Structures are given as C-alpha cells and as structure tokens.
Amino acid sequence: PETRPNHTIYINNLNEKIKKDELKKSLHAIFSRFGQILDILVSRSLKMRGQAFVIFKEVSSATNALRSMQGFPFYDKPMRIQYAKTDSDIIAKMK
RNA sequence: AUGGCCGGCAUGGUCCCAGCCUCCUCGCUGGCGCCGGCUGGGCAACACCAUUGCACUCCGGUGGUGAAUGGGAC
C-alpha cells in the first residue's frame, strides 16, 4: 500500500457522467496553478472511467497539488488524489 | 410508412399556416389514420443498469418509431 512521490497524480472518484474532452479541460482549469502540466489522460472505458492521470513536469507540483486538492468538490464529488504507481511514458521519455 | 420489409382494415383530393414527433439523411420536396407480424446497424447523442477501477491500445451492457395535431385556401 501507499505509493512513492511521482510526477503523475492519479485521481479517481471523479464524476463519470462527464465527457472526456471537458473533464480534461476542467481538470486543467484547477490544477495548472501547481505547475506546468504535460498532459492529462482520461479514459471512459469500464476499467478506467472515473479516474484520471494528471502528469506534472515537476514532482514538487504534483506533491503540492496532491496535498491541496485532496477532498476537493469537483462536479459534486470529492476528488481522491494519490501519486501514480509508475511513471507515465511522457515522463520515461525524458527522465 | 419506416434504419430495411410484408400483411389486414380504413380513408374524397391538392395545396397554405401553425403545433407536435423522432437513436439510426433534425427539418419546410421528413412525419404526425387503425391493427399484426419480419429483420439489420449503433453505442455517436440522449437514458438506464453495472462499475471506485493504475493507465499510457479504441473497446462493459441494455433502451427509444411501443412516436407526434389542428386550423385555412381552393
């Protein structure tokens, strides 16, 4: 259990009734102030719906975002944030 | 008539205006009498069910047409 600090924050318990394009945009709307964002990956498949991967360029940003937005009401539901289990390719491709 | 198709019945005709209808050419050269049955596509939108799930491969399922009216000129 518990994951180590990552460039990517995993968010779940997201309102599934929201279309993908929008959700990505809305997330960017509230997480950009924590640092540059490389990408946000949203999938509405059975397995990946209700979750999202916010990929920050600097771990500190992900750390800040994780500590502040935890519990935040988004689309009438409280976000549940953690660090992603493994680096995201966009990250591998660099560091 | 409809995503494509057949049958029973009913029913004077053509146009104009508005209102309403719908998953499958959204609107003025689409449709808006009654009844029965045959079959295809798709989750794209809408809805419902199920799902709290760690990805970098798009990808659970089911439902709707089993729909919607009047006025006016000839």
Side-chain angles (χ1 to χ4, degrees), chain A residues 1 3-16 18-94:
Chain A
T3 323
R4 282 79 284 295
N6 205 318
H7 269 86
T8 288
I9 55 167
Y10 169 89
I11 310 177
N12 72 337
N13 188 213
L14 293 163
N15 187 310
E16 298 173 16
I18 311 301
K19 293 187 188 70
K20 174 180 178 189
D21 166 72
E22 176 170 340
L23 182 66
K24 287 169 66 163
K25 280 167 183 177
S26 282
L27 280 167
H28 188 80
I30 65 182
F31 281 106
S32 49
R33 57 121 156 168
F34 286 103
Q36 184 172 62
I37 289 180
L38 297 185
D39 205 357
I40 298 178
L41 280 32
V42 166
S43 170
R44 289 238 274 180
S45 61
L46 181 53
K47 191 186 176 194
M48 293 306 100
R49 80 187 43 186
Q51 300 130 54
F53 293 72
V54 178
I55 307 179
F56 286 99
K57 183 203 174 192
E58 286 194 349
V59 185
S60 57
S61 288
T63 300
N64 286 54
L66 180 58
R67 293 170 186 164
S68 334
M69 306 306 302
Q70 175 61 57
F72 186 87
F74 191 62
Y75 286 105
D76 304 307
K77 302 187 64 189
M79 297 184 310
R80 182 146 67 241
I81 315 165
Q82 314 169 183
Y83 282 120
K85 284 176 171 86
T86 55
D87 295 21
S88 300
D89 300 353
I90 5 307
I91 285 296
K93 300 180 182 304
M94 301 187 81

